[PDB]
Amino acid sequence: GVKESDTGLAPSHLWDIMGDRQRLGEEHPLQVARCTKIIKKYVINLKQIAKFVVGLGERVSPTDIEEGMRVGVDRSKYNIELPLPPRIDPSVTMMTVE
Amino acid sequence: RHLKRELKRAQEEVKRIQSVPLVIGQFLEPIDQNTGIVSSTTGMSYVVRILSTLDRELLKPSMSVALHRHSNALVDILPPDSDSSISVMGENEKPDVTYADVGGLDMQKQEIREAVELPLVQADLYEQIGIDPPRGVLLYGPPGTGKTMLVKAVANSTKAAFIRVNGSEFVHKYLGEGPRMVRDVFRLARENAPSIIFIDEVDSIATKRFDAQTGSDREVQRILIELLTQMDGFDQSTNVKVIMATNRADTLDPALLRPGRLDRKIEFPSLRDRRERRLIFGTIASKMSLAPEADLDSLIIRNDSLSGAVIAAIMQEAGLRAVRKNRYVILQSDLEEAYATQVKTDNTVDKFDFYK
Amino acid sequence: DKTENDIKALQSIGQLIGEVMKELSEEKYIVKASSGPRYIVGVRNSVDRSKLKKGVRVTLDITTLTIMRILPRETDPLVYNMTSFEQGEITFDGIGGLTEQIRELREVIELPLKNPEIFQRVGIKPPKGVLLYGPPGTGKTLLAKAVAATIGANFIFSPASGIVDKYIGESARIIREMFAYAKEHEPCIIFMDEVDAIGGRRFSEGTSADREIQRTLMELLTQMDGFDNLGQTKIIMATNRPDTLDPALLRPGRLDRKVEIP
Amino acid sequence: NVMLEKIKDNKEKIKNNRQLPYLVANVVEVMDKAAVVKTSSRQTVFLPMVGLVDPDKLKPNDLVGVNKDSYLILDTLPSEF
Amino acid sequence: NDKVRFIKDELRLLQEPGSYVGEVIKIVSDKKVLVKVQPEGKYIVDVAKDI
Amino acid sequence: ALMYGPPGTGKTLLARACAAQTNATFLKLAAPQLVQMYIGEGAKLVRDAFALAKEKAPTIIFIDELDAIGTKRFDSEKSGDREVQRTMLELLNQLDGFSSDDRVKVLAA
Numbered sequence A: 001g002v003k004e005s006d007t008g009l010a011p012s013h014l015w016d017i018m019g020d021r022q023r024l025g026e027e028h029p030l031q032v033a034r035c036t037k038i039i040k041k042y043v044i045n046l047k048q049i050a051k052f053v054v055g056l057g058e059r060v061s062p063t064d065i066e067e068g069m070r071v072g073v074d075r076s077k078y079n080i081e082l083p084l085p086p087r088i089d090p091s092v093t094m095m096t097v098e
Numbered sequence B: 001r002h003l004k005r006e007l008k009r010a011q012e013e014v015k016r017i018q019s020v021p022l023v024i025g026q027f028l029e030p031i032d033q034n035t036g037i038v039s040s041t042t043g044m045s046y047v048v049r050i051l052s053t054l055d056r057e058l059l060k061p062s063m064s065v066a067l068h069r070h071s072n073a074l075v076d077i078l079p080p081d082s083d084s085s086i087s088v089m090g091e092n093e094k095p096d097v098t099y100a101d102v103g104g105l106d107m108q109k110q111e112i113r114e115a116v117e118l119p120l121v122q123a124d125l126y127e128q129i130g131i132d133p134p135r136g137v138l139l140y141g142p143p144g145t146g147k148t149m150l151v152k153a154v155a156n157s158t159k160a161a162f163i164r165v166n167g168s169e170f171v172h173k174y175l176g177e178g179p180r181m182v183r184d185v186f187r188l189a190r191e192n193a194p195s196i197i198f199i200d201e202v203d204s205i206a207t208k209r210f211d212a213q214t215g216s217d218r219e220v221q222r223i224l225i226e227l228l229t230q231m232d233g234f235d236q237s238t239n240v241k242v243i244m245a246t247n248r249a250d251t252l253d254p255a256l257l258r259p260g261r262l263d264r265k266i267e268f269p270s271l272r273d274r275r276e277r278r279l280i281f282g283t284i285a286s287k288m289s290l291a292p293e294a295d296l297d298s299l300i301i302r303n304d305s306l307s308g309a310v311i312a313a314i315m316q317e318a319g320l321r322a323v324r325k326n327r328y329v330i331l332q333s334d335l336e337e338a339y340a341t342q343v344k345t346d347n348t349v350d351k352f353d354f355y356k
Numbered sequence C: 001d002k003t004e005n006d007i008k009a010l011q012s013i014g015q016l017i018g019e020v021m022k023e024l025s026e027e028k029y030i031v032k033a034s035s036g037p038r039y040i041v042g043v044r045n046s047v048d049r050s051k052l053k054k055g056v057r058v059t060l061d062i063t064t065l066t067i068m069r070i071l072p073r074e075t076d077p078l079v080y081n082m083t084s085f086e087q088g089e090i091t092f093d094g095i096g097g098l099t100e101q102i103r104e105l106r107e108v109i110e111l112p113l114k115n116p117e118i119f120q121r122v123g124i125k126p127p128k129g130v131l132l133y134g135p136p137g138t139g140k141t142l143l144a145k146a147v148a149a150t151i152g153a154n155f156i157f158s159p160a161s162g163i164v165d166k167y168i169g170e171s172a173r174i175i176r177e178m179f180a181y182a183k184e185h186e187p188c189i190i191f192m193d194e195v196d197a198i199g200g201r202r203f204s205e206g207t208s209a210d211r212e213i214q215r216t217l218m219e220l221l222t223q224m225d226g227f228d229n230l231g232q233t234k235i236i237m238a239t240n241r242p243d244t245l246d247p248a249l250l251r252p253g254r255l256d257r258k259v260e261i262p
Numbered sequence D: 001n002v003m004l005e006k007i008k009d010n011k012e013k014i015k016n017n018r019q020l021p022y023l024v025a026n027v028v029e030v031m032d033k034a035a036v037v038k039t040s041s042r043q044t045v046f047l048p049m050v051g052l053v054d055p056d057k058l059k060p061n062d063l064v065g066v067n068k069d070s071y072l073i074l075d076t077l078p079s080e081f
Numbered sequence E: 001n002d003k004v005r006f007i008k009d010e011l012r013l014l015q016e017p018g019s020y021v022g023e024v025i026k027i028v029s030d031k032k033v034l035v036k037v038q039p040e041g042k043y044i045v046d047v048a049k050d051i
Numbered sequence F: 001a002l003m004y005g006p007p008g009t010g011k012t013l014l015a016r017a018c019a020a021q022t023n024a025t026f027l028k029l030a031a032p033q034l035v036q037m038y039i040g041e042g043a044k045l046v047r048d049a050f051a052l053a054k055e056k057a058p059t060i061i062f063i064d065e066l067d068a069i070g071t072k073r074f075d076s077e078k079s080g081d082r083e084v085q086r087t088m089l090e091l092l093n094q095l096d097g098f099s100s101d102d103r104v105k106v107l108a109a
């Protein structure tokens, strides 16, 4: 075929059936946001600049949600799903980890 | 014959799509008589069908237009005078200054009357003789010589539409709105021609240097390209081009001062000779109540440099000080005191007089 | 009464605010919405077509975008924090030792408010614009503080550096409001402290940060005196040192009195 | 006995509307009973305020929640920085 | 007749899906084109079969 | 109060003792973090820091190395920066009396 190919076209057949199960599941998309204030409830800010007060996901304890932390929220009614590792600057200083 | 009646009745039905609400676009340019290009005020361009039986003569010159919200179809047209953020003043906001309040600078008065006034009243003279008409007018000079005050006078006399914009109305906060201000302002002039556009200070928009990385700069570049484009489109109208002032001359973009755009450069001096100084003192002092003992001739010799705005301040100060003494007139004691303050001009020989 | 008030409250719904950009016809006006898009909207039969003209601010149903009612003019939240300030009173003899500068400041601020008939006699146009400058710590803010609790006119208090915003030209909109607010409530005073932040020198070779400042400074010049003259609005500047102020602002006439406090 | 049943019945309908999540705003002005809020989606709505959330608490610029489905002042939010 | 067949059927054509203006940045040999709608980003999208 | 002297005499140490002993609110701030490259985002941070200090009152704001908000002595016509300048002058208006400077003490080192 050699159109929309980027692999050895042998492990991508099996990968093709695996991606159908991930497309049906909503592990993604998760819109990436960041916390601004924990309210003993959270004050989330989206990147498209519009702020929301959200609840809590059934995936995670509230112990793991911290100040300023990057968090993924639902595509629809915004709810905190998964904590993420911080820092968006890493793209010059990540290049020098030897 | 029966089909001529039904074409009328069946044409009332497409006319009933025009309804509240509508979203406003601006007809950019044609590409067919059944399709054109619009640019919504949302920031999006669209290529949409035109509605049958609409004026194809009036769409082409950039005009505001109506869209139907839920498809962006071009269901009808709006007037050319409408949807203008900034409208023609003059109803009663026209300033009170006139050529009589203005004093000296007689050379400048003559130039600008020849640059702005004579083309409107008599276009024919310029063609006959075979000179190119001075088009755009530029005013530079060091701050406070009466650049704006000479333009106030001109707003009264002309009896032609007048559109007055600060240079900061063009910087918007949302998007593409800078380009949208320029496009409106030039159309509005052409519509109620002949017309004068005045940008009080154009300096920040006409800057010489751009980083072209920060968003802020990338948005000014668009405003400045549009101004240059429509400055050449202005040609072959009754309109006299934009007249604009800046107290800075080193920072100007030289892309404005190429020929065919801004042509005539006016100068306003800071230096005042002895004759031209007495002329300014004469007009301010004729309004005010003075003793006949006081005399302007005593003043003019002392300073060898002074400008029309420093003189304005001196008269205020002599007339403010007259209130402390409680004197109807400005006595020559007040006039002298007020002269020595708001002059200075000593930084260079202040204590370094041994250079002579 | 309060828990039944929530049930009835949920039947109401917000209304997108706009302003009348220009009367097209008596049936349909053009309104610009605060969200952004310009619309052509209908009218209610209750609303007086004679109060709907260019400039007035209206509200819209979000269902139909049809004019629901007239609204008075609304003061931005920035300009409300600037009037909020000033608490308590400081005596006007509690400033002492500078009794001469207090009187030269009243020649500009107190006098033309009460008796514009005296300045009409001589024939001179009243002075506006006062520049306070002196060594740091001499009391240039104390003088302005005392006189703004005393006089009784509406008083906008503005840290010069507190009106800069990140977004493009948002700093332009603020300065226009302050003069629009003041022109409305008049007689009023606008006082700006430490005006080196935005009265900086010319530059035009520096970064983009310098180029944004140049745009608010260019505007502040044409707001004091352009075509339209201020009314009973008086403007007081305070600075640590006048040397680093742009020459177009310092200029006699634009800020008439230049009071030195020793 | 009837006053205790009124406050439990109306509270089941307040708790359904108070459901998370909900947009954030601040109050550009209280007309003073009206609140014009400027939402954090950068538009402006006028509304006759919810009489449960007092006009006393509200001073310009303070944060309030707003029900995203239909713009009502749902609650008052703690000030934060 | 060309008129009246057009007027009646015109209402169904005016419920348009809209259109956009991009510009060809570069093509690739999958028959796809990279075009930029100006306010937004860029899109890789295929040509209709006919052109 | 201001602390000035040779490096290594323990100006930072002394402030650290004060933080643990007084059981007042201790807001650590570093003067170069305050400076920000966005246009006027560094000014917004000064006002937010003193506003937070009103709630938690009484407070101590300890600023380190005030050399990042440097000195105002420039006025050139070619460049001049004038960024560090703006956020320094915002800091002076919070040290003034309009803002309560009686609930908030400042340790400068």
Ligand SMILES: Nc1ncnc2c1ncn2[C@@H]1O[C@H](COP(=O)(O)OP(=O)(O)OP(=O)(O)O)[C@@H](O)[C@H]1O
Pocket: B101, B102, B103, B104, B105, B142, B143, B144, B145, B146, B147, B148, B149, B150, B247, B280, B283, B308, B309, B312, C221, C225, C248, C253
């Ligand atoms: N020839 C003159 N006759 C009478 N008055 C004058 C003359 N020149 C200047 N003035 C006085 O000086 C004032 C200042 O003038 P103006 O504000 O127009 O200066 P400008 O050139 O616009 O300065 P800027 O650089 O600030 O724009 C005028 O309002 C007027 O009262």
Ligand SMILES: Nc1ncnc2c1ncn2[C@@H]1O[C@H](COP(=O)(O)OP(=O)(O)OP(=O)(O)O)[C@@H](O)[C@H]1O
Pocket: C094, C095, C096, C097, C098, C135, C136, C137, C138, C139, C140, C141, C142, C143, C240, F092, F096, F097
């Ligand atoms: N002339 C004065 N008489 C009495 N007290 C004074 C005088 N000048 C200054 N003070 C004292 O100084 C304090 C603050 O001075 P102030 O803030 O007015 O100085 P400043 O010139 O405004 O400083 P900056 O240059 O930083 O703006 C006042 O609260 C008062 O106690």
Ligand SMILES: [Mg+2]
Pocket: B147, B148, B200, B245, C226
């Ligand atoms: Mg001018």
Ligand SMILES: [Mg+2]
Pocket: F011, F012, F013, F064, F109
């Ligand atoms: Mg240290």
